[PDB]
């Protein structure tokens, strides 16, 4: 019953939230429709959260840093969602149980809620389904939404376009990442000597970033040092994110960014549906893959590809 699902979701019921999400992430069109009204209906309870995107190479203490940061926040009374975006999920069907235990503490904290990357046809669709899932979390009372890049593909721009603040975690020992960053945090600044060489590296990143013009005069990206493993610097790291929130709330820039992202996700969903017509049948898929291949092979022009494809999919 969707009325009950809604009410219990609004009441903060973890099982109702998990179930609404399942339907919103579904690759069945009938399921997705079913919960469109529900998300729309609870939209006025969304948005009262800090959305942070977090990235860094595999091997930088990302999951560790998240487990620790998230635990600090649940201890102080926050309810924290951790959602993944993984471009490989455009080729897998998604994951039933995901990989919760990379974050040992959060994985068992009922003040947390951890979800793996949804499946969809395009990266745009994966990210858009993630926005819808963020809205459900918020409506169920999660006030911190962490969205992390997982895998090796290009998810950084999408994660940044899903959140208010984009956090880059770096080691002390992809170009585009720097200009997405609202803050860099040099990790593994261990009390024993790691602090010296991460403080060095932070001066290098801090020096270089002076040459980039930030998108707003309201905020100048800082570079900091932390230890994710021993919990160092995590409190001040969070206080900078809070400070960003207060400043860009006062100027209306948090809201203006979100409005722009939302329209972007709307168009991404329109384009996902179009893409779904490419796999409408084997014949349509064959012919459209060969149009694309022709263009990618240099054999016919982009415009000829485009018209072949447009005819095939009824456009």
**Is 99 annotated to bind ligand?**
yes
Q: Which is nearer to a copy of itself, 73 or 139 (CB)?
A: 139
Which residues between 248 and 267 bind a copy of itself (CB under 8 A)? Answer: 255, 258-260, 262-263, 265-267
Instruction: Tell which one of 56, 116, 118, 221 touches ligand GNP (CB under 6 A).
Output: 56
Q: Which stretch binds ligand GNP (CB under 6 A): 25-33, 199-207, 224-232, 275-283?
A: 224-232
R_g (Cα) of the chain, nearest Å: 21
Beta 165-170 vs 144-149: how paired, if at all? unpaired
Which residues between 59 and 78 bind a copy of itself (CB under 8 A)? Answer: none
Report if residue 307 touches a copy of itself, rule: CB under 8 A. yes
Contact 134, 83 (CB under 8 A): yes
Which residues between 23 and 62 bind a copy of itself (CB under 8 A)? Answer: 24, 32-33, 36-37, 39-40, 43, 47
**Is 305 annotated to bind ligand?**
no
Q: Which is nearer to ligand GNP, 62 or 257 (CB)?
A: 62
DSSP structural state of residue 250: H
Distance of alpha carbon 62 from alpha carbon 180, whole angstroms:
17
Q: Which is nearer to ligand GNP, 73 or 185 (CB)?
A: 185
CB 286 to ligand GNP: min, Å: 35
201-to-75, 110, 184, 195, 227 alpha-carbon distances in Å: 31, 37, 11, 10, 14
Q: Where do the H-state alpha helices sit in 26-88?
A: 29-34, 36-41, 62-75
DSSP structural state of residue 88: G
Distance of alpha carbon 77 from alpha carbon 242, whole angstroms:
15
CB 311 to ligand GNP: min, Å: 39
Q: Which stretch binds ligand GNP (CB under 6 A): 86-94, 116-124, 183-191, 288-296?
A: 183-191
Extract the tokens encoding 210.
């002076």
Report if residue 197 touches a copy of itself, rule: CB under 8 A. no
Task: Give the bridge partners for 148, in sequence order.
Answer: 54, 84
User: What would the x/- binding string for a copy of itself be over residues 160 to 189, using CB under 8 A?
Assistant: --------------xxx-xx----------
Residue 301 binding partner per list a copy of itself, ligand GNP, none, with a CB distance cut-off of 5 to 8 Å that depends on partner kind: a copy of itself
Contact 177, 168 (CB under 8 A): yes
Residue 270 binding partner per list ligand GNP, a copy of itself, none, with a CB distance cut-off of 5 to 8 Å that depends on partner kind: a copy of itself
DSSP assignment of 257-299, as one string?
A: HHHHHHHHHHHHHHHHHHHHHHTSSHHHHHHHHHHHHHHHTTS
Which residues between 98 and 117 bind ligand GNP (CB under 6 A)? Answer: 102
Task: Give the bridge partners for 144, in sequence order.
Answer: 50, 80
264-to-28, 112, 166 alpha-carbon distances in Å: 22, 28, 17
How many Cβ atoms from other residues are within 10 Å of residue 175's Cβ? 5
Which residues between 135 and 154 bind ligand GNP (CB under 6 A)? Answer: 150
| Closest CA relative to residue 21, chosen from 106, 120, 130, 111 | 130
Q: Which residues bind a copy of itself (CB under 8 A)?
A: 24, 32-33, 36-37, 39-40, 43, 47, 128, 131-132, 135, 174-176, 178-179, 204-205, 207-215, 255, 258-260, 262-263, 265-271, 273-274, 277, 291-292, 295-307, 309-310, 315
Give the residue ranges of the annotated binding site. 59, 61-64, 99, 148, 187-188, 190, 227-229
Give the residue ranges of the annotated binding site for GDP. 59, 61-64, 187-188, 190, 227-229
């Amino acid at each position: 019953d969707m009325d009950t699902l809604r009410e219990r979701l609004l009441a903060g019921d973890r099982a109702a939230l998990a179930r609404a999400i399942t339907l919103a992430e579904s690759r069945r069109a009938d399921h997705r429709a079913a919960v469109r009204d529900l998300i729309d209906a609870v939209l006025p309870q969304t948005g009262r959260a800090i959305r942070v995107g977090i990235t860094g190479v595999p091997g930088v203490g990302k999951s560790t840093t998240i487990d620790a940061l998230g635990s600090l926040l649940t201890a102080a009374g926050h309810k924290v969602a951790v959602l993944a975006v993984d471009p490989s999920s455009t080729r897998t069907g998604g994951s039933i149980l995901g990989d919760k235990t990379r974050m040992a503490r959060l994985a068992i904290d009922r003040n947390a809620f951890i979800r793996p990357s949804p499946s969809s046809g395009t990266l745009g669709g994966v990210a858009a389904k993630t926005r819808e899932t963020m809205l459900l979390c918020e409506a169920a009372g999660f006030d911190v939404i962490l969205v992390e890049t997982v895998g090796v593909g290009q998810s950084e721009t999408a994660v940044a376009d899903l959140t208010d603040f984009f956090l880059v975690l770096m080691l002390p020992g992809k170009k585009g990442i720097f200009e997405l960053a609202d803050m860099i945090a040099v990790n593994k600044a261990d009390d024993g000597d790691g602090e010296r060489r991460a403080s060095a590296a932070a001066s290098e990143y801090r020096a270089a970033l002076h040459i980039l013009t930030p998108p707003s005069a309201t905020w100048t990206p800082p570079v900091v040092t932390i230890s994710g493993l021993h919990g160092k610097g995590l409190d001040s790291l969070w206080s900078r994110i809070e400070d960003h929130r207060s400043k860009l709330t006062a100027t209306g820039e948090i809201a203006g960014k979100r409005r722009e992202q939302d329209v972007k996700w709307m168009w991404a969903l329109v384009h996902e549906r179009l893409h779904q017509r490419l796999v409408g049948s084997a014949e349509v898929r064959q012919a459209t893959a060969e149009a694309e291949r022709a263009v990618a092979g240099g054999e016919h022009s982009p415009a000829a590809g485009a018209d072949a494809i447009a005819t095939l999919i009824g456009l």
